[PDB]
């Protein structure tokens, strides 16, 4: 659909009670805009030296760290 166009959104409360939630206008329509889903993996630094630290509770194997090695913290 070619812009401009209004963007209403409503949700079934119960038995056809369409309740309005969202409202806006139509941006560029194309599949090229790819969405990136993020995941934060947590940890705890239980040994602390000068600029070097041992952290647990982020993985549980050993070679998991060999799998997620180049990814920066």
């Amino acid at each position: 659909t070619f812009p401009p166009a209004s963007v209403l959104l409503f949700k079934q409360k119960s038995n056809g009670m369409h309740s309005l939630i969202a409202t806006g206008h139509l941006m560029s329509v194309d599949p090229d805009r790819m969405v990136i889903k993020r995941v934060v993996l947590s940890g705890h630094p239980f040994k602390i030296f000068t600029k070097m630290a041992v952290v647990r509770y982020m993985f549980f194997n050993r070679e998991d760290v060999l799998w997620f090695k180049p990814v920066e913290l």
Binding site: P31, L66, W67, F68, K69, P70, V71
Partner: peptide, 18 residues
């Protein structure tokens, strides 16, 4: 085999080239 893979460019949508 650790943090990289193939994932080549194959099969796209119908692009209506202006």
């Amino acid at each position: 085999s650790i943090c990289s893979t193939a994932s080549n460019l194959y099969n796209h949508p119908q692009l209506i080239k202006y």
